[PDB]
Design a protein around this ligand. Sequence first.
Ligand code: W0F
Ligand code: MG
Ligand code: ZN
Ligand code: ZN
Ligand code: ZN
Lengths: 115, 257, 528, 8, 82, 67, 49, 49, 428, 44
Amino acid sequence: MNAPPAFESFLLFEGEKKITINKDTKVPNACLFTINKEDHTLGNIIKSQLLKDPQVLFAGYKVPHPLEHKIIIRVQTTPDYSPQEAFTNAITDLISELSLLEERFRVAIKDKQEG
Amino acid sequence: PYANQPTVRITELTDENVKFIIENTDLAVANSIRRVFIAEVPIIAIDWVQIDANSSVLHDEFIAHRLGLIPLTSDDIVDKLQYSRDCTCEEFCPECSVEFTLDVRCNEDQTRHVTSRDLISNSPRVIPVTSDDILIVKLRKGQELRLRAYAKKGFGKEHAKWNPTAGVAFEYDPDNALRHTVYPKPEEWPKSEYSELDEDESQAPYDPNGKPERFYYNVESCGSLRPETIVLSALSGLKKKLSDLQTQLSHEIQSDV
Amino acid sequence: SLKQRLKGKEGRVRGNLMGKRVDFSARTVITPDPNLSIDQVGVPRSIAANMTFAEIVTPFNIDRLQELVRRGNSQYPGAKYIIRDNGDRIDLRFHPKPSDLHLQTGYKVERHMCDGDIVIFNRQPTLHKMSMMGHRVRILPWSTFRLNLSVTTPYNADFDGDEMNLHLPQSLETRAEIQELAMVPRMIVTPQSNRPVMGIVQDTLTAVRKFTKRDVFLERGEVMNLLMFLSTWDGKVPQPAILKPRPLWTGKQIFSLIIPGHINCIRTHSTHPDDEDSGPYKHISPGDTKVVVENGELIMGILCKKSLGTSAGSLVHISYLEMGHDITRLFYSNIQTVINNWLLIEGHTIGIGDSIADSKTYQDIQNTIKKAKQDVIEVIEKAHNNELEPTPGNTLRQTFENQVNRILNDARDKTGSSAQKSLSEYNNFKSMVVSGAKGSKINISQVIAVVGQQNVEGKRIPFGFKHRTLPHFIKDDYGPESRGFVENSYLAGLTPTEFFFHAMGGREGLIDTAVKTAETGYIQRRLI
Amino acid sequence: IWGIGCNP
Amino acid sequence: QANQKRITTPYMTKYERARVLGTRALQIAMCAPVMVELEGETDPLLIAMKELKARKIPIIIRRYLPDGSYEDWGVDELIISD
Amino acid sequence: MIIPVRCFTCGKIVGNKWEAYLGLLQAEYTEGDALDALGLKRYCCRRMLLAHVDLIEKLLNYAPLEK
Amino acid sequence: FIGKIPIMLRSTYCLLNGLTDRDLCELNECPLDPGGYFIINGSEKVLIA
Amino acid sequence: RDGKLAKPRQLHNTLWGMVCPAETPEGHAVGLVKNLALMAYISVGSQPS
Amino acid sequence: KRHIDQLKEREYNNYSWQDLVASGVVEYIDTLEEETVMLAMTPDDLQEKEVAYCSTYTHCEIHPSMILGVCASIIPFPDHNQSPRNTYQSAMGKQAMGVYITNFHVRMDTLAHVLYYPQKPLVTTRSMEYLRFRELPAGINSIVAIASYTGYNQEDSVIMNRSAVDRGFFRSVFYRSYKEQESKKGFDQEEVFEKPTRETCQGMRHAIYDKLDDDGLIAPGVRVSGDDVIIGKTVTLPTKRDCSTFLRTSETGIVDQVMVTLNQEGYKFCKIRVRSVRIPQIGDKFASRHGQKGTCGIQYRQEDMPFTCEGITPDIIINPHAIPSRMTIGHLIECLQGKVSANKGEIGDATPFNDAVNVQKISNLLSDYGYHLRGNEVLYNGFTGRKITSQIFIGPTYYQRLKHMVDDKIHSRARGPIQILNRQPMEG
Amino acid sequence: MIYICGECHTENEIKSRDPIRCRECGYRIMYKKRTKRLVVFDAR
RNA sequence: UCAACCUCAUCUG
Ligand SMILES: CO[C@@H]1[C@H](O)[C@H](n2cnc3c(=O)nc(N)[nH]c32)O[C@H]1COP(=O)(O)OP(=O)(O)OP(=O)(O)O
Ligand SMILES: [Mg+2]
Ligand SMILES: [Zn+2]
Ligand SMILES: [Zn+2]
Ligand SMILES: [Zn+2]
């Protein structure tokens, strides 16, 4: 009777922002990105790619509550770098990696067949 | 500061299985690709059932559950079909759904096995993976099952009926060299199929500078989507999720400025 | 009769006046929630929709309350009733009442229970005042009350079908009284025994013991992930304990960030050698036992129920007595969160391999049992030949029983010690016993070595049949097997007679519990 | 179920 | 009693703090004038806590001694327990 | 009551395999050999067929309410 | 006629006694039902020894 | 059930093979409600003549 | 051997237990005679010549395991568990959901729970055959991992796989039957089944009376939400009074069967059965066959659950901290034997005192099928993909869904109905 | 309405305030028969 | 804009 509908896991209700950016006052050059209706799938990918960046001092993600559907990513970068830029670059790098993976998987498929 | 270039080598390709290896990739990327295999690959399955007459022993919602779990061929038109929420028309239409019908009566004395074959689709591309058959119910003489169903696009995050895959086998570091798992007695542990160690050596020597790479996948299709296209659709869907995230992030950054 | 109406329990005086059924109360099953804080409780939406709190309409809250009234009883964050100044209760459930939706100062909007409301949480029986505590509401999906696991011990609650009552204060005055006199962070230390009522428990305790070993080294990503779940974090990553060859933090180094303020504590781990304090390596402690927290930093040690548990002088108790109750609440919550995520990494389990011991261990256990049975045979022969002489204050029967019991108990203890020697570091029974999370060395011994003597009414299994225990045994057999000694372990499996005698012992324990409840309840009522 | 000094 | 010959503790007890905070909260929710300048606080209990910290709650506690006499201690006079 | 569609643990379709399982048991095949022939590999899928109790046949003995 | 005695099900005087499982199915009774209870006012009652 | 004496409730040795040792209700009826063992039979009675 | 061979051919040989008694092979012994009889638990171990304990055995037990009852006979490896845990399992097995009878469709019984997909246990006791547990099982075999995953299995709770639940795992049907009898007490005062009318009948409620048919009884197949009018009964008032029955609050079911008969008095009598399909939630109670139960702490999808190399994700995750204090080692032995049975294809034998089934033999059997001797398995964390450092005990164990469900227990009160005498809130 | 007979499974139409006895068999147990309105089941 | 009390038995922590 109190069971949430399944579509709540990924469908934004009206007036809900996918991303909200709030700066972290405790430390300079740090930010906190709150992604709504997202899970570990995107969070772990983004955290790993942010960790690969040398100018990202801190990168972490958390699900504040398993029953609710939200991801919080803290990103702290060096001076002369912006955490928002680090997030954008992480996303673009992951997109490029996934596209390369798609192309090579298609080639591997075509080669496993037809020979 | 940039993404690595992954490489794929497909070892096995059968109508039910894809065994491949992804090298030069992160553990997070590999795990999330597996995760998208399981939960975020769109598929077609029955989600609306209306039972005109059910005199079978199984109650109506039991029949509806079993009908939902029946796989449906979704190779091509699942990409063409729209989600019901996206479709402009009220309720369901040919663009947002596929209609199935079941009209079975056991007039004969012998028990009638209602199968997925008795489900008849309005569009030929979606069929209940019939081309034995999944048994929906057994009908005694004088028992009848009549129903109309609508099948919609969706992914396994909504419901396990929309899982395109049966079992995604994911393994990294077949010989424990990163010591991510610390065996109390290494010798008692069976060797992995992908293990390259000699029989004498239970574990590879600890590699201090190693990082998890060369992930091994075995994706078994449920028959709705071909095992190759499960992987391709999962990669494309993860890329689309990242692109949507980037678009929203750019909009909010512009708003902050 | 009129006397019967007023006389006993269920009478007017006791059943209707001293205690009575009350409104604004909700009962449901409880399930764990590690993510909730100590004071937070998890409330289903239906329960929060039925229960209401009346809020006086003021100039500063008139807009929000009018929005809630507009939503009504149907939309969840709404109002069930509007009480006018005259006392007339406009009903928002039944029909729009468009003219009566207006709010003015002095009206009372009976809004639905929302996040941040203070509610009393109760479990029966309320044996002590920690059984009723004030919790801050958080509304979560599904239909169970969800409470933090550090709060289970005061309530005596386990999530195996238990239910908890919830009482909602209906006035600001009583809300403030509940919040101040009964809030869970204020209830951490009991006046009964001047110890904390709550401590780290279950998975978190075992994972803390594993986390604070010297061996635990955490890489950069794991450190960042764990610092994500530390709410009191200053945002500064500590310099790792090992800078080169690769930057690796330590479990103690990260737990030092959990410990709040500057707290000074000295404890000792459960497996602390008594020789270490007297001899050399007092402050080096080869086993990393002892526990030294200086300036709120864990310099050395492995934490267990003695350091993070409900005992006087614990790190929790010192935190409450030094930093205050709010900071201690944060301390509990942070321990649970970051240690549970590290446990997600390391993992914990129990299997058959824990119950298995070495072949040499099993052989030694068998030899000890053989020697004990032979010694009992010798004592029985001495008694039969009348060589035995009564111990002062005891009959010959009583002294014979005492000697046999001593031999059997000594053999049982020796087998248990052999089984415990067999245990490896990786053994998980030993992990749970050492951490203090669950189990005891007695349980390990019974699992691995010997179940032990089955005794009913403080004596070996009685001669229920005519001069024998079971029909399978010959009459007048006082040996270990006949009178109830179980040499097989649980893993080995009890033989049929041992099974029946073990059932006799378990039955006695169950009867004791069931009989105990009522007598203790009567005593408690009389004292109060 | 253990011994005479323990528990039943 | 008078300012002299006050024998009760100068510190405010936990129960006195609870009842004072609740009473002031109820008054504030009943449109009573607020002594402290609220910094965007719209919760009557939070405003009452803020007033208690600033020692501006306009209440005097009458503590009844067991002999029947009473002592009037102002909230300002009492030392806040927390 | 009737063989479930899809193994609970993984989701491989096991609903089409019960009649073939019974036929292979009638042939001579041991339960394990029949399970292997049907293609069930993981013990999760083998649990579905191995532990299944088919009560639908007992329920079909009772006459229908409407004939 | 002096009275009516409730009959324990599947006892010698029950109608279900001596009936094969097919006949029990024809009467909408379970072949596996043990019996040993009385139907009093439509409710199954079991005498406890 | 009200009686708190722990004598009538305890598993007697003579229950072996005739009453289940494990199966008893828990609460006020521990050891007071019992269940027959699988092979146990109860005498129906006979004429001593 | 003659008697055993004749009994083995029992049917079409007209040899039965009564012939065994008549031959003098077996004998019925009561407690008084049990006091005067030397018994042997087993023939081979005891009757045969050894160091002579007794040489005057007068009887032999047919099998020791028969000392247990009906509910304790389903417990696998009961000799490896602590004694109170077997009592707990007897109590809980009386509460498991399964197909109670095959004629459940015909019976209109209040509070009937029937499980969708019952399964027979992979590890079974022989005496279960005589309890008909195979014919009408109660519970499902489930892949269970004994691990501390996210803290939602702590204390006694249980983490469950949401995908498995979505695939039919432990889904049940709850039938509630309502009875109403129209009756005439006064000569001018009668009760009639009819659809109540707002004007004609003085007593009415907000509850929708539209679903009632012409006869005043809801037809089968109509969804009925809580507080809707199942049966419409009106009493002539010497205009009319509404005595119509309503659904129990939060029932939220679909009508299954509506029967209209005449009772013994000759008055019209109506029974209406409502189906509510209950899917496992995160409050429902599940228990193993070894006396340790627990509510569902949380449900994670298949992507979130830990996975083995083969891709198997546990249906149920139970906290390891349950095992040590309770000492239910039979649970661990049943997991190991179930793994062996599922890979082998046989059904494991867990008779209490077999003496031919050691734990070591089960481990050696499991080794042949490619798994670790002790049943541990390298589990990969579902969220991050990293191998869990401690290898986790996984196996197929039989679990039962107890009738206690959170939906039946959730309750809340706010200025509701009040008693007449005390003028205090009501009870229940 | 129309009530299906318990035993002979033949639909008989019984008016209100009429004894519940099937024509041609006499059985006193009738069943209300499934509704014409149709209810949507989500296959979930 | 809206339904009884007794009694007993069975279960729950
Ligand atoms: C731990 O103490 C509790 C409480 O004291 C409360 N309680 C329970 N029954 C009663 C009763 O009749 N009367 C009163 N007054 N209180 C009662 O229940 C006790 C334990 O009982 P248990 O021993 O069965 O708890 P498992 O050890 O069995 O827990 P598993 O592993 O099943 O989750
Ligand atoms: Mg409990
Ligand atoms: Zn459409
Ligand atoms: Zn499977
Ligand atoms: Zn008829």
